Amino acid sequence: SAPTLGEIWKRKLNQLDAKEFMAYRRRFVVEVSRGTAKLAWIDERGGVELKGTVVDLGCGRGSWSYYAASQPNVREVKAYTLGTSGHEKPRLVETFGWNLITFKSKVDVTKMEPFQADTVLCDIGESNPTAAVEASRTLTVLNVISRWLEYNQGCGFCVKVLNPYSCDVLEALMKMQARFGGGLIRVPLSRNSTHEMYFVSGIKNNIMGNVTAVSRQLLKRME
Numbered sequence: 001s002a003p004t005l006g007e008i009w010k011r012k013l014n015q016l017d018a019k020e021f022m023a024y025r026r027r028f029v030v031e032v033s034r035g036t037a038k039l040a041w042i043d044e045r046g047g048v049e050l051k052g053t054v055v056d057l058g059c060g061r062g063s064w065s066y067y068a069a070s071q072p073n074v075r076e077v078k079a080y081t082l083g084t085s086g087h088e089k090p091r092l093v094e095t096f097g098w099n100l101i102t103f104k105s106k107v108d109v110t111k112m113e114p115f116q117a118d119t120v121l122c123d124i125g126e127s128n129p130t131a132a133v134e135a136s137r138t139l140t141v142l143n144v145i146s147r148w149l150e151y152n153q154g155c156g157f158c159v160k161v162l163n164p165y166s167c168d169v170l171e172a173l174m175k176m177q178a179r180f181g182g183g184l185i186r187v188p189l190s191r192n193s194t195h196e197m198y199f200v201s202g203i204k205n206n207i208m209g210n211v212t213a214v215s216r217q218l219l220k221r222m223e
């Protein structure tokens with residue numbers, strides 16, 4: 001049922017006008033950066049142990065990196081993002097832990113050699129009206145992340161899954177869970193206009209069931 005229900009949600013979402021979309025997207029949603037709040041939520045729930053060498057793949061402005069850099073078990077943060085035309089570039093600030101981060105823009109992380117890391121973070125996935133476009137980008141991220149997880153036996157991880165209801169993606173996630181453990185969670189701070197979920201090392205759950213539960217929740221909210 002998962003692809004059917006998420007696909008229904010997507011087609012219904014795309015039928016909303018500007019006013020309906022704006023009202024729908026915040027309905028019952030919890031709530032400085034959105035990025036910070038989401039990683040903080042996952043961290044406080046025990047979704048991911050932030051420790052040692054943290055990689056932040058697709059760091060954009062870098063909220064996750066600054067979050068990670070302020071945590072007691074983190075030793076360094078290596079942050080990477082495209083930062084090319086019309087893509088977010090890291091925003092340097094003077095907050096606690098800033099000196100632990102190395103930001104590198106102008107890097108396509110899908111083409112980077114994995115290296116040593118104790119925690120793998122990745123928040124790549126831009127919403128697109130076409131669910132199949134989102135599935136393809138999601139698959140690409142998961143394939144890249146699998147190489148990192150293979151290279152770093154036992155590392156912690158927290159990975160955005162932009163479209164988790166697509167059948168190919170579900171099978172990909174089950175395979176990652178079979179290989180690396182972990183589970184798939186919905187952050188209640190996510191807006192109703194995205195079906196994004198997070199593949200995390202700290203929580204071990206029923207992936208397909210959680211996805212379906214999120215589809216049914218987001219559909220009910222649109223009713």
Ligand SMILES: C[S@@+](CC[C@H](N)C(=O)[O-])C[C@H]1O[C@@H](n2cnc3c(N)ncnc32)[C@H](O)[C@@H]1O
Nearest residue numbers: 035058060062063064081082087088108109123
């Ligand atoms: C919007 S950030 C997610 C938010 C971020 N965690 C934060 O807290 O600010 C996702 C970033 O991934 C970047 N990105 C997308 N594809 C990429 C790729 N192939 N290689 C490197 N960065 C990529 C995008 O430019 C985008 O800025």
